Protein: Ammonia channel
Organism: Escherichia coli
Amino acid sequence: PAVADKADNAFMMICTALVLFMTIPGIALFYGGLIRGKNVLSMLTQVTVTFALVCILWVVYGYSLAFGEGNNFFGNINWLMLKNIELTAVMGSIYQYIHVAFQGSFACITVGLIVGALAERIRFSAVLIFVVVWLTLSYIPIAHMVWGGGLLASHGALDFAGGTVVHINAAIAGLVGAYLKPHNLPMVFTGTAILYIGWFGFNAGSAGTANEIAALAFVNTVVATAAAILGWIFGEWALRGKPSLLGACSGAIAGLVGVTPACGYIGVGGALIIGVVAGLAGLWGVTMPCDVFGVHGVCGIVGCIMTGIFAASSLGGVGFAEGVTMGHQLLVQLESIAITIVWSGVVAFIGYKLADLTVGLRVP
Amino acid sequence: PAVADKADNAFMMICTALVLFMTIPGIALFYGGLIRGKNVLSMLTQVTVTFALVCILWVVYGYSLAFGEGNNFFGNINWLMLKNIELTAVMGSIYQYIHVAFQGSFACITVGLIVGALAERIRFSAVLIFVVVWLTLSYIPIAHMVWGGGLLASHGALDFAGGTVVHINAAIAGLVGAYLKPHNLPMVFTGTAILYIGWFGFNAGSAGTANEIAALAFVNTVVATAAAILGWIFGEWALRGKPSLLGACSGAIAGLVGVTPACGYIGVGGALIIGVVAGLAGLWGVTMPCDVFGVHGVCGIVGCIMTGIFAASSLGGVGFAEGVTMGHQLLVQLESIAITIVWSGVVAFIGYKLADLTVGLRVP
Amino acid sequence: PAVADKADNAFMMICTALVLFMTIPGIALFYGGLIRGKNVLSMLTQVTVTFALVCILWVVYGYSLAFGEGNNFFGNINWLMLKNIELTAVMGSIYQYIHVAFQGSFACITVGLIVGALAERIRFSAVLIFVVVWLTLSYIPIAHMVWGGGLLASHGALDFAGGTVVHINAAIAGLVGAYLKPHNLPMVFTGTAILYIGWFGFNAGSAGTANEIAALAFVNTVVATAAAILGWIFGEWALRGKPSLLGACSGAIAGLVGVTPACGYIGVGGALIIGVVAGLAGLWGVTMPCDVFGVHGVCGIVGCIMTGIFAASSLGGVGFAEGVTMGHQLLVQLESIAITIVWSGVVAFIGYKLADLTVGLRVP
């Protein structure tokens, strides 16, 4: 019988708290300082209520459908309300309950990334309707595909902490939203700060254990965020003549997003190069609300492609799987992106249409 | 010789930091956004200074008198300044020093819950006087009774993380206070957020170890808070036509309070039902400063009663003690509530009277 | 082969996150509420960008030059980009990578303490230039001397968590700066709160392990901060007739600074006495931006001297080294202070002069 390691339990519970902290209040405060002042209270309210909702859907069927025995695309409905999960059931080296909470917390930040951006111009019941649809039909299957031993995992896709699952996923759902004035920067700074601190639970907890890989993912997190800040600020300086607080924060986020899939597979060299490239591509991206999805999306993609590179032992990475060339890993990452982009697309489109046809989309 | 487990040490120290974070700045910021703007600075000051004071009383005699060898009601004065506690002394599976800090942190949030609410209309030296009296004569004996193997423990009272010790206790002391405009909701949101994040140290650290029970209490924490938010917001929507940010936050707190005694004894089913019922009863409660004590009090009681139910193996709980019916456990919880309510009553009354007769109660 | 303990890994990673949290956003928010409103955005920006920079210099050569095989004053350039540090390399009882991050995080808060104070009246490129110079030529050698088995360590200097390395060091660099209106106190309160919470990672993580010494340093942290608050507030009350929020926060910081070198070597008795003395000396100090350095400096020195005392087994301490009198330990602490003060002096002076002669110091 697999036996739980209390060091890992402790690490994973604390990491889960940190990920929770990313949404409550990190992303809430982040947008809070960015959206028009008359909309903050309502936005803060829609994030909190949809967070609650995402927590509940998860314990009811979310976890089971994402992580239960299933097919290439979804699990089962045989862990409803966590039935048939023994309290002492182990998963990896931790109790399965901690796996339930940790993964659930990722589902939350994904949703809050979308709700925060779209709370301004969406009717409440519409967003609620949306959350249900998209969590169930996009976050869950994609989570199953990447981390639940579904299609993408069984093809060897390297995505440590959710470049596709959290980032590209939410970014698409958000931009379909868009398709269908910064008043408190200190508050934006604060939310960003909290996102960065939580993000350590996020990337490092993704090791499932307090080992050398969690150590690697942690260090790399520091490195990429730092690299991205400077790459962004230098870009901002070169373009605009000077850094701004918003540029600085945005850079942090570019690097964090960009390193998300890679943190556990790459060397600090890899971490730094990925940070710089993510900062600049982010900055390039916003140049070419809604912007957030250009950062998550662009930097999400850039990270996933570059994982397919810096995982190489050659470049200081942990190495690709046996018999996997860097060429092949690159095809694989590209295919995972293409799926994520397309899957989230159809589902969000469906999400908004159902809402639109049920309650109407734009605020009364 | 009992030997300390470094995984538990680590978990418990981090949990202690989280509980500390609940008071500094969680509760301070919570009230900060709620009380009149002209009173915030002074309130923030009275919380910080009484926090310091509670830390000091605890190391001087508080811990020993709450957790030392004693009678049914109080310990001893043989751990003054932690004398006769070996640095390597173990308690449970952690070093006793970590037990000192963790428990001390619970004493703090209890006090800060009261000071925050009453800083507006109480003279400083009066509140100080009060803190000394009530910490010494109410928090300590009740802590001894529930967790120090006193009267209530030796009768089998289920109270995992302080439904009686923290909640009903403070709520009564506060309402006796009362008996004798929300200007920054983002700040209220922020404090609430911090309280929720710390609350994981609070409920889960109450396992004393990073085991499956800490896992259970953590998951349940997420579940109950979520359930409570929705139960509250739906009530608010049904009554008032729409949710508010304050309702949302309040719901979070209803669930957190409501699950406090139960988190370690109940199934996720139990967690959810307790959350919903606590959200609604909270909302019902505030309907029928000062409100905070209606939430802590009502939801404190509701949690303690419902623990006496959902602990049953029958309902997905960990099970009652051997030879204990659910009927008997219900009598026991009810008696613990009745004691807590009454004990805190007399003591707070005494607290305020001494202050009143020494320095006067209302601000000069 | 030395083998990594996952409990310690977990503790140390979480402690590193907490220390990071001290700078992002703790110190940023602290100053944010203190400096003129027109300067906050730019200050927040200079802290974030110099944080990024300090993270990068550290991974490139900082860590190796501070902690590599070297002389009495500096390490080597044989861990460039962490080359020749095996991913599984162990240090103490944790993976060396966690040692890289943890120590790196101390470098950050040191820098942010200076940048925060001087962002108002220094040109950006000047501060940047400065950071590079002073981190490389002062923080690093002093870190090597105290913690990297250099001059000061090999003479038996007791400095648990950086009374000299972080505090006196930064305080001097800052006051040389000076030598060459509080608008949001709630924000000051918030930053202070975050600094205190992070500070537990800071003092306790300095054990390198979740053991009884980390337990001791944690408890003492609570004790000294509490003692300092009251010692300060009582001083403020005695002098000014009443406490202020700023006094309360400042006291917290006096105690935290004052206990920094001592937390791991002294009894709770020692902790309390050191807190009180640090609160008062801090308050005395500010009486006799820029003030911050009077608190860090004075309380830094007071802590380092008093460590040389309360480490004694006689006074409840862990005891001095074999064959070391308390007299001798006192000479040693005094010499460490004198070196730190003088070393940081010359280096900061050089830092500002280079900047001045390159880009100019005062804002255009």
